[PDB]
Amino acid sequence: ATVNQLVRKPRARK
Amino acid sequence: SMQDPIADMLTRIRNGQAANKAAVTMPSSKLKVAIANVLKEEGFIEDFKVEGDTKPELELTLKYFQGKAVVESIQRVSRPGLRIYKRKDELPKVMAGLGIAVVSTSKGVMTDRAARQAGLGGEIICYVA
RNA sequence: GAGGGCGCUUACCACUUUGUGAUUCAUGACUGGGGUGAAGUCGUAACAAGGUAACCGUAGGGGAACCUGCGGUUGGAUCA
RNA sequence: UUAGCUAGUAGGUGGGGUAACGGCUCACCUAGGCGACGAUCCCUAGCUGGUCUGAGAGGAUGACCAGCCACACUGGAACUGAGACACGGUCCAGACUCCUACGGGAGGCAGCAGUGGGGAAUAUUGCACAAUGGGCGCAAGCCUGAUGCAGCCAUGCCGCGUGUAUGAAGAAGGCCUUCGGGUUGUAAAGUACUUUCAGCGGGGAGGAAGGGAGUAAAGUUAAUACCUUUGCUCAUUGACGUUACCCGCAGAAGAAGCACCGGCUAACUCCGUGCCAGCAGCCGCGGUAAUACGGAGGGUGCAAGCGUUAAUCGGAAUUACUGGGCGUAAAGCGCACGCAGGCGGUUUGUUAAGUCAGAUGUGAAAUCCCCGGGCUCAACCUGGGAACUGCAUCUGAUACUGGCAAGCUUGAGUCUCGUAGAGGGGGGUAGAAUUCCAGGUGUAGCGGUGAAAUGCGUAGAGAUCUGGAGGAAUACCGGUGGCGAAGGCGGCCCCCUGGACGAAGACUGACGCUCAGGUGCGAAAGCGUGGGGAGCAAACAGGAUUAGAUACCCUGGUAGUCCACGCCGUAAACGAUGUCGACUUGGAGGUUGUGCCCUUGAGGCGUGGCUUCCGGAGCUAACGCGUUAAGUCGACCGCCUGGGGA
Ligand SMILES: [Mg+2]
Ligand SMILES: [Mg+2]
Ligand SMILES: [Mg+2]
Ligand SMILES: [Mg+2]
Ligand SMILES: [Mg+2]
Ligand SMILES: [Mg+2]
Ligand SMILES: [Mg+2]
Ligand SMILES: [Mg+2]
Ligand SMILES: [Mg+2]
Ligand SMILES: [Mg+2]
Ligand SMILES: [Mg+2]
Ligand SMILES: [Mg+2]
Ligand SMILES: [Mg+2]
Ligand SMILES: [Mg+2]
Ligand SMILES: [Mg+2]
Ligand SMILES: [Mg+2]
Ligand SMILES: [Mg+2]
Ligand SMILES: [Mg+2]
Ligand SMILES: [Mg+2]
Ligand SMILES: [Mg+2]
Ligand SMILES: [Mg+2]
Ligand SMILES: [Mg+2]
Ligand SMILES: [Mg+2]
Ligand SMILES: [Mg+2]
Ligand SMILES: [Mg+2]
Ligand SMILES: [Mg+2]
Ligand SMILES: [Mg+2]
Ligand SMILES: [Mg+2]
Ligand SMILES: [Mg+2]
Ligand SMILES: [Mg+2]
Ligand SMILES: [Mg+2]
Ligand SMILES: [Mg+2]
Ligand SMILES: [Mg+2]
Ligand SMILES: [Mg+2]
Ligand SMILES: [Mg+2]
Ligand SMILES: [Mg+2]
Ligand SMILES: [Mg+2]
C-alpha cells in the first residue's frame, strides 16, 4: 500500500 | 505525528464542515495563512483571525448553504511520503474546471486559473472540490 | 666490416596427460510421500450439547479415523 | 534456497608499449579495492529506433526496414595493409568427409538457390546488369545471387466480378400444418438490358538519364592541334514484357462457399436414438416429447475465403503508481529495543540543491499523428509540419522541499512534591487442607459408580483425637478490578529494583516518529546435568463397559509437574485489529488523582490518567465498530494474490 515499500521491492508479477 | 500540518489543517476543516460546527481553531503558521486567505478569496470560507504570538492559533469561520456543506470534499494530493510536481501546462483541474487546485509557486499561492496568467508550476497542495 | 637470413635456445601460450575437487544433465536397483478415483473392505471422527464440547501448540500411544497428558482460546450448547 | 569477492587485484614511481590516455605490460613501493543504492556466483537473452495491445499509465516482444555490436566448422596466433586479429587471406591443433600409386593432400553454403535431416510448418537448383548503389580504370568498358525482377506459397492486407431491369394464383418440389393455409418465393423459369475481368485480335505511355560519332563557342597554349566545358545534330541504349493502359468482338455465357442455430450470442420446428452412442469454450445436454445427439426443412453471421488449434495483451482495479486489501473471506511478524533507510513542529536569513519559467544545442531516417499530392480506387508510396513528454548547458524567480546560520516553544525530555498497583528478582515466615508415620479410644466394613468390580481392612481399616515429618498451592478478600511490551502476574513481611500517572513551577531547545538485517524477552509440553517428591498424572498395571476397550468409568502408578543450571523459541502467543500523532455529537458506570466550595456528611462544582457496556452521524459484504474506530487523515514498517499440493 505504501509507495516507500515499493521502493525496496516492487509488486511481484505472477 | 503532525508531520504534514497541511493535511492536519484539511482534517480539521472537513470534520467541522460536515458536523455542523460554527467555527474551528487550529495552530497557525505562515503557510496555513497563505492557504486560508486564498480560500477566503475563493468563496469557500468566510473569515480568519490570528491569536497569540508565542503560540500562534489560527481560527476559521465555517460556511453553509441551508445547513449543507459548502466544501463537500477536499483531497490532499502531495505529501511528505510522495512529492507531486507539475508544469505550467500539466496543471490538473478539479471537477473538469469547477473546483480549484491550490498550487504554490514563486509568485505566491494561487489557483491553476490564476496560474494561466502567471505561467508557472510547482507543488500541488490540495484539490478544493 | 656493418647488416640480414637460416638454425639453435629461452619467455608467453592453445591443444593434450596424470592426480584430485566444485558444478550440471541423462540413466538408475531401491525408497519417501502426496494427488486423482460414484459405487471395494474397515470403522463412526467431525458438523446439534454430533451422543466424552470442539480446536491450536506440544509429548506419548496404537491398522486407521483418533485417544490421553499439560497449557491456551471461544471460532461451544445449557446458563445466573 | 548466492554475502563476502578480489594479489596485476586497488593506487604510486620508473622502464616498456600502441595511432592516442591508461596495470596495456614489467620490477619496485603501499594495502588497499569492490559491496545490502546488489559486489560476486548461477541461469537466461543480441540491444535500440519500433511493432502489437491498452482511454491513458502501463504491459508483452525485437521477423520484414534502418542503426550498432558480436560471430563466419571448433580453438589459438600473427602477418599483410590507411583501415581486420580477416565470411569466399594465411599458419598450427582437434573434429568430420573426400582424393590417393599409402607416403600424403583437399574442404568450410550462418552468400544466392538447392539436397539430406530435424520439426506442426516456410519457395525456383530462374532472368538481367535496363535502372539505382558500390568496386577498377583517363574514359570507353567490365564485374556486382547487392539490388532490380519473375515463378511458387489464398501467407497477410486492399479492390472488383461471379449479372441487372422486369416478372404472382404465388408453377413444381421439399418441409411445416389445428389439411383451411403458410413457407421456400421475384427467388427460379420466361420476358428485356449489359459486358468489370478472363478468353480472343489490334494499338500502345512511362520506368532512360546518359553513353557514343560529327560539330560551333569559350578556355589555356608558340598554336587554327590535343584536351576541358557549354551548345546543336544524327543513329541508338528495357530483364521485367505477350507491360499498365486502350480499341474491337461474342454471349450471362468462364467465375460462391463455410460455420452456426439452449443461454452467453444472431436464428425454430420435425424425425431418429435412449445417460448407450455422441456432443462440449463455459453452464452442463440425452435412460421414452432432446430446437443442445444424428439427419432433414428453414434461417442467421461472414465471404474468395470461412472455421479450428497454439501464442501475446486487453477484458483482469486478478501484483491495484494511476487504481486493491489485511476484526471473522488469503493476509498485522508473539512482543520490545534500536543502527542503516524513509520522514519531520515553528520564525528569520542565506544557498539555489530538488522543483518551476525562458532560451540554445540535441533527441538519424523510416513507423504513428495533421493537412496535402500520386498510382482509375483502396492498400501502398510520398511532401512539409507536429510528435518524439528525453538529456545536457546558460539565464531567471524563492512560495514549498533540501543544506547552512541564528532562533522560538505547543512536540519530545529533565527536576521537585506526591499517590496507586498480583511489576520482576532474592531471602525468611504463617495457617488450613492432602498424604505418610507414631500413639490413644473404637468395630465390620471402608472405598468407589448409572449399577458393580479391581483395591484396602479384624496385623484393627475407615472415622475421631494427640504429636511429628515432607511436598506444592495460596480459600474468603476478588470485582468486564489493578499492573506489566507481551506470554503473563495473587498468603504475609523485609531488602534490592523497574516503569505508569497527577499537581505546582523552573529548565534544555526538535533533542522526534518509525523500523529490513541485528539484539533480548517470550504459555505449556519436551530435551541435558544434579537434586526433590505430597497430591495430580502420558505410557503402563488391574477391574468394569463392550462386538472388541486400545478410549470413556474406577482402583493404583513412572516420566513430568518442584528447584538450581542450561538449551529448545513454537501456541486459538486472540482485542483473530502493527506503532505514533491530529481532529469529529454524546450517556450508563468503574478505577485513579487533583482544584475550588454555606468543610454546613464519606457530599456540591469542575478537571486529567486508565477501563467496560450502550448508541447518533459516518463507515462496513453483513455481523458490528462508532472519541480507546473498524469515522475522516498523515508518518513508517510487516504481510497476502483461487482451493488442495503445502
Ligand atoms: Mg463421531
Ligand atoms: Mg465430539
Ligand atoms: Mg482445554
Ligand atoms: Mg606508468
Ligand atoms: Mg534482406
Ligand atoms: Mg540488422
Ligand atoms: Mg573481428
Ligand atoms: Mg579468424
Ligand atoms: Mg563461404
Ligand atoms: Mg540462404
Ligand atoms: Mg523428421
Ligand atoms: Mg409442396
Ligand atoms: Mg476484362
Ligand atoms: Mg523512351
Ligand atoms: Mg437470440
Ligand atoms: Mg454439430
Ligand atoms: Mg425421444
Ligand atoms: Mg477479399
Ligand atoms: Mg490460451
Ligand atoms: Mg491489470
Ligand atoms: Mg480485492
Ligand atoms: Mg481467513
Ligand atoms: Mg499482537
Ligand atoms: Mg525519426
Ligand atoms: Mg521526415
Ligand atoms: Mg509518413
Ligand atoms: Mg483518393
Ligand atoms: Mg496439612
Ligand atoms: Mg531558553
Ligand atoms: Mg529426556
Ligand atoms: Mg484412565
Ligand atoms: Mg527434567
Ligand atoms: Mg505460528
Ligand atoms: Mg471477540
Ligand atoms: Mg444510528
Ligand atoms: Mg457502539
Ligand atoms: Mg498458491
UniProtKB/Swiss-Prot annotation, chain A:
It comes from the Bacteria. Belongs to the universal ribosomal protein uS12 family. Part of the 30S ribosomal subunit. Contacts proteins S8 and S17. Interacts with ArfA. May interact with IF1 in the 30S initiation complex. At least 19 substitutions or deletions in 11 codons can promote streptomycin resistance, dependence or pseudodependence; all but one of the streptomycin resistant mutations (K42R) are associated with hyperaccurate translation and thus reduced translational efficiency. With S4 and S5 plays an important role in translational accuracy. Interacts with and stabilizes bases of the 16S rRNA that are involved in tRNA selection in the A site and with the mRNA backbone. Located at the interface of the 30S and 50S subunits, it traverses the body of the 30S subunit contacting proteins on the other side and probably holding the rRNA structure together. The combined cluster of proteins S8, S12 and S17 appears to hold together the shoulder and platform of the 30S subunit. This is Small ribosomal subunit protein uS12. It comes from Escherichia coli (strain K12). The chain holds residues 2 to 15 of 124 of the full protein.
UniProtKB/Swiss-Prot annotation, chain B:
Pfam families: Ribosomal_S8. Keywords: Repressor, Ribonucleoprotein, Ribosomal protein, RNA-binding, rRNA-binding, Translation regulation. One of its GO terms (biological process) is cytoplasmic translation. It comes from the Bacteria. GO terms for cellular component: cytoplasm; cytosol; cytosolic small ribosomal subunit. InterPro entries: Ribosomal_uS8, Ribosomal_uS8_CS, Ribosomal_uS8_sf. GO terms for molecular function: rRNA binding; structural constituent of ribosome. The keyword DNA-binding does not apply. Part of the 30S ribosomal subunit. Contacts proteins S5 and S12. One of the primary rRNA binding proteins, it binds directly to 16S rRNA central domain where it helps coordinate assembly of the platform of the 30S subunit. Belongs to the universal ribosomal protein uS8 family. This is Small ribosomal subunit protein uS8. The gene is rpsH.
